[PDB]
Design a protein around this ligand. Structure first.
Ligand SMILES: N#CC[C@H](C1CCCC1)n1cc(-c2nc(Nc3ccc(C4CCNCC4)cc3)nc3[nH]ccc23)cn1
Length: 289
């Protein structure tokens, strides 16, 4: 519905592994009346990458929720190459950088607001039987001081109807420090692995993205910085299956840390649901207020 002719490049907004996102201005009248949108593009167009990008586009088109980034349209050439996804432009960027540059104005009540918003978005994803597979603060965008949104779905898969997990291993490497143990060992991805990752997101939020306190830093100072290559993953595996966990972040109440640890249960069936998480987080936020 968008013609590439009229898309005017302004700057680059974010760079991931198979594509990137540009701030551009859709201005068909050529008078700077058009609106500023975000455009996700591909860095290499294989047909594997093209088919997965199309599946992701149709996934995002099927979503509507106040904590999901808004699909706007598609744009292409010549042909059916150069595929580009148009989305609403969120002007405060990723939650990672926003929180790392405003750490002195975001108290625990606002972090709990963000947390409950993420949980509502994730539950909405689950009702459609989608597995996000990449829940992290770098993948959360900020609409304003009171609203955040899940903003990338490049790894999201739909569950088959007879099973509740999804087995997939991608080429290249993976954000293994957000991954549940069953996703490192058997490549199984489900709602419960998304709950593990959300526990990690909670940890991130309450570290305020301190650089020494990142999950990679903490995990590889727990296993030793001498490990390299595949062995890293291996050691991580055993560390997690001996109940080694990320430490409680500085200033984080024990109620929150216990939510985190309950989402890091090794038994994949003893993890909380996103609705139970939203309930507990809302009750804590109400006790603080
Ligand atoms: N999730 C997610 C990650 C995703 C990556 C791209 C490919 C995969 C990972 N990624 C999505 C956006 C993005 N950013 C905005 N706003 C916005 C963004 C950045 C700034 C910076 C602030 C400081 N100064 C320089 C600009 C300001 C405003 N809006 C958006 N809509 C849809 C996406 C999107 C950016 N990276």
């Amino acid at each position: 519905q968008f013609e590439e002719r009229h898309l005017k490049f302004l700057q680059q907004l974010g760079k991931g592994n198979f594509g990137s996102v540009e701030m551009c201005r859709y201005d068909p009248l050529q008078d700077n009346t058009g609106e500023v949108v975000a455009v996700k593009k591909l860095q290499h167009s294989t047909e594997e990458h093209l088919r997965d990008f199309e599946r992701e586009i149709e996934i995002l088109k099927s979503l509507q929720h106040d904590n999901i980034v808004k699909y706007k349209g598609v744009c292409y050439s010549a042909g059916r190459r150069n595929l580009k996804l148009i989305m609403e432009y969120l002007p405060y960027g990723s939650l990672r950088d926003y929180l790392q540059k405003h750490k002195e104005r975001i108290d625990h009540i606002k972090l709990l607001q963000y947390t409950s918003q993420i949980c509502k978005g994730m539950e909405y994803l689950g009702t459609k039987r989608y597995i996000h597979r990449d829940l992290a603060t770098r993948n959360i965008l900020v609409e304003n001081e009171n609203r955040v949104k899940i903003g990338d779905f490049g790894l999201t898969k739909v569950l088959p109807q007879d099973k509740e997990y999804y087995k997939v291993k991608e080429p290249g490497e993976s954000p293994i420090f957000w991954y549940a143990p069953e996703s490192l060992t058997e490549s199984k991805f489900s709602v419960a692995s998304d709950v593990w990752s959300f526990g990690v997101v909670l940890y991130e939020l309450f570290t305020y993205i301190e650089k020494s306190k990142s999950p990679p830093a903490e995990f590889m100072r727990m296993i030793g910085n001498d490990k390299q290559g595949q062995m890293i993953v291996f050691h991580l595996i055993e560390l997690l299956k001996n109940n080694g966990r990320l430490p409680r972040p500085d200033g984080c109440p024990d109620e929150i840390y216990m939510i985190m640890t309950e989402c890091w249960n090794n038994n994949v069936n003893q993890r909380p649901s996103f609705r139970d998480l939203a309930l507990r987080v809302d009750q804590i936020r109400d006790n603080m207020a």
